[PDB]
Design a protein around this ligand. Structure first.
Ligand SMILES: N=C(N)NCCC[C@H](NC(=O)[C@@H]1CCCN1C(=O)[C@H](N)Cc1ccccc1)C(=O)CCl
Ligand SMILES: OC[C@H]1O[C@H](O)[C@H](O)[C@@H](O)[C@@H]1O
Ligand SMILES: C[C@@H]1O[C@@H](O)[C@@H](O)[C@H](O)[C@@H]1O
Ligand SMILES: [Ca+2]
Ligand SMILES: [Ca+2]
Ligand SMILES: [Ca+2]
Ligand SMILES: [Ca+2]
Ligand SMILES: [Ca+2]
Ligand SMILES: [Ca+2]
Ligand SMILES: [Cl-]
Ligand SMILES: [Cl-]
Ligand SMILES: [Cl-]
Ligand SMILES: [Mg+2]
Ligand SMILES: [Mg+2]
Ligand SMILES: [Mg+2]
Ligand code: NA
Ligand SMILES: [Zn+2]
Ligand SMILES: [Zn+2]
Lengths: 142, 191, 254
């Protein structure tokens, strides 16, 4: 970045690269050694990948080299926190949280059901026996 | 349906995403993940994506060894066609993120260089844990300045010649590793 | 059961010991007070159909206690698709003449709904398999009920991790493998018809039936079980059908 009267002072990283945008060679004339310039330029000309704010649903971006990482709030997941955990209550997802049977209802909430000899609890997800010896329970242990 | 191939683990600071091929044509995918003796958990149900975020599963125990599989289902809705992924142990395989130099203070004829706490996706007690909270003594930070310094914390107390202006750069390193021992260098910051 | 442990008395309350002419025949699983599920191949050499006994509450074959309940087997229903001497469609639904009485030592195992079984139970890693079968391939049978914890495998992996053997049966959609390939643990001859039970959120369900294998606990091989989920509708329908004169009934499948 050249501007006549501003090019009278000697080399400076703060003036040419921090306050202004410098080229590879300008940076090279500052560091002189190749490997030094190398590791400065490597991150310098990389670009802030979080500048476009890719982390949805209130997430936080942290820039990396030619990439970023999204830190999501509790209810979200995904590379960009795009996935809502609250919109995943379906039967293929850990049995919809049902203790026994689960029934999908697209558009509405899924419902939980129970095996014969059991009945659905208050919560709408747990089952309780309605007979003395319900199936699948080992009495001598309880 | 066709089976998914080139299943790969992309992980940095425990944000772990499984990726695969091919782009689906008349088929959707479902991902399962488990520990060698645990139950399979389903994720990314009937997705058309060729990736799946598994961060929330692996951060339950970063030292466990996980295996994932990608089910292929036909468009519309007998075990499905699937492919298994390489096993993945987060603590031994997650990439160390690019560090950032927080500050440098000339405290006397010495300069203290502070490395910003790298946060990970592991969130013990509401907050995200740093790399040091997870690795402890397994993690060290190395400084390349102008030559080399190493630390068991996030600070370097280095000797400098008065009024000379040095340049610094840091790297997260897990010395016990043989593969993927270190992070990419941090942006260079000079006095 | 090779490499297992003795199931403590009362802890495998749905296990059924099947007897023919008083001799030990196979295992079975109680699903309600009148119905028992077992394996079809257990009935391949049966001539005296009126001499089939099911014993519930059994534990130690050498001692009779007040917990054992024997009932005559009224009907043995098998898929007509099953071919004697083979492996496919290895399931039998048995009707007991009089119902067992449910007690601390006699409790049925839940037969689950098909979808719950296919989408949920199928992904629970470990399940128990029990029986009084051989303790070693070609060795002697057990006197106390044995039980083993085995991990389930999807058929593609089972095919991929099993040593090549020509003349061996196909693993069909009506079957599934479970077990270890290191030669340490497996179900064995005489355990057939016994349950492969799966625990899920406090309740045990029937997912498989001990069916066949290439030798018990043979390196490079797993135990093969009947995939009960393929038969839920067939079983439910037949449990509603009226009693027939003959003992054996080959019902159409599906
Ligand atoms: N490895 C195991 N888990 N084995 C369990 C075997 C149970 C046993 N089942 C059987 O004996 C069933 C019935 C048909 C033949 N048969 C078999 O097990 C065949 N021997 C398996 C086989 C034969 C030839 C080549 C390859 C494999 C029974 O109790 C009646
Ligand atoms: O908005 C989405 C895009 O935003 C910008 C990011 O650098 C890019 O990686 C991302 O895909
Ligand atoms: C999980 C995320 O962490 C960071 C914050 O700036 C966001 O608001 C959110 O809390
Ligand atoms: Ca300039
Ligand atoms: Ca200028
Ligand atoms: Ca210059
Ligand atoms: Ca120049
Ligand atoms: Ca960057
Ligand atoms: Ca006895
Ligand atoms: Cl840290
Ligand atoms: Cl009777
Ligand atoms: Cl066998
Ligand atoms: Mg300035
Ligand atoms: Mg310049
Ligand atoms: Mg130059
Ligand atoms: Na074996
Ligand atoms: Zn008993
Ligand atoms: Zn008796």
């Amino acid at each position: 970045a050249n501007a006549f009267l501003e090019e009278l002072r000697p080399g400076s990283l703060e003036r040419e690269c921090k306050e202004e945008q410098c080229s590879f060679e300008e940076a090279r004339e500052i560091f002189k050694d190749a490997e030094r310039t190398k590791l400065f330029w490597i991150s310098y000309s990389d670009g802030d990948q979080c500048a476009s704010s890719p982390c949805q649903n209130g997430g936080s971006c942290k820039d990396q080299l030619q990439s970023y990482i999204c830190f999501c709030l509790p209810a979200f997941e995904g590379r960009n926190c795009e996935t809502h955990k609250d919109d995943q209550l379906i039967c293929v997802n850990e049995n919809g949280g049902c203790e026994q049977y689960c029934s999908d209802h697209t558009g509405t909430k899924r419902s939980c059901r129970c095996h014969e000899g059991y009945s659905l609890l208050a919560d709408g997800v747990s089952c309780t026996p309605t007979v003395e010896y319900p199936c699948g329970k080992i009495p001598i242990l309880e | 349906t066709v089976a998914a191939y080139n299943l790969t683990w992309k992980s940095t600071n425990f944000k772990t995403i499984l990726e695969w091929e091919p782009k689906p044509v008349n088929q959707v995918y479902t991902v399962q993940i488990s520990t060698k003796s645990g139950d399979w958990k389903s994720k990314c149900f009937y997705t058309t994506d060729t990736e799946c975020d598994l961060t929330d599963e692996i951060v339950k125990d970063v030292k466990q060894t996980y295996l994932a599989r990608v089910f292929s289902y036909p468009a519309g809705n007998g075990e499905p066609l699937y492919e298994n992924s390489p096993e993945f142990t987060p603590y031994l395989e997650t990439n160390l993120g690019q560090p950032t130099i927080q500050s440098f203070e000339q405290v006397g004829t010495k300069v203290n260089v502070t490395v910003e706490d790298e946060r990970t996706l592991v969130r013990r007690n509401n907050t995200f844990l740093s790399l040091r909270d997870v690795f402890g003594k397994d993690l060290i930070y190395t400084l390349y300045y102008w030559k080399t310094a190493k630390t068991n914390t996030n600070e370097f107390l280095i000797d400098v010649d008065k009024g000379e202006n040095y340049c610094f750069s840091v790297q997260a390193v897990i010395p016990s590793r043989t593969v993927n021992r270190k992070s990419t260098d941090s942006p260079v910051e000079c006095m | 059961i090779v490499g297992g442990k003795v199931c403590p008395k009362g802890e495998c309350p749905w296990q059924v010991l099947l007897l023919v002419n008083g001799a030990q025949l196979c295992g079975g699983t109680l699903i309600n007070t009148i119905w028992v599920v077992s394996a079809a191949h257990c009935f391949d050499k049966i001539k005296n159909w009126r001499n089939l006994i099911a014993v519930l509450g059994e534990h130690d074959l050498s001692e009779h206690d007040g917990d054992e309940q024997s009932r005559r087997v009224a009907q043995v229903i098998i898929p007509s698709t099953y071919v004697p001497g083979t492996t496919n469609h290895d399931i039998a639904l048995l009707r007991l003449h009089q119902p067992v009485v449910l007690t601390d030592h006699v409790v049925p195992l839940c037969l689950p709904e098909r979808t719950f079984s296919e989408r949920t139970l199928a992904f629970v890693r470990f399940s128990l398999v029990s029986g009084w079968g051989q303790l070693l391939d070609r060795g002697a049978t057990a006197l106390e009920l044995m039980v083993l914890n085995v991990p389930r495998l999807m058929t593609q992996d089972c095919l991929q991790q099993s040593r090549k053997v020509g003349d061996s049966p196909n693993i069909t959609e009506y079957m599934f493998c479970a077990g270890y390939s290191d030669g340490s643990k497996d179900s064995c001859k005489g355990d057939s018809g016994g349950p492969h039970a799966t625990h899920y959120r406090g309740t045990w369900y029937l997912t498989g039936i001990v069916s066949w294998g290439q030798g018990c606990a043979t390196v490079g091989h797993f135990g093969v079980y009947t995939r009960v989920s393929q038969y839920i509708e067939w079983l439910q329908k037949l449990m509603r059908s009226e009693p027939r004169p003959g003992v054996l009934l080959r019902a159409p499948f599906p």
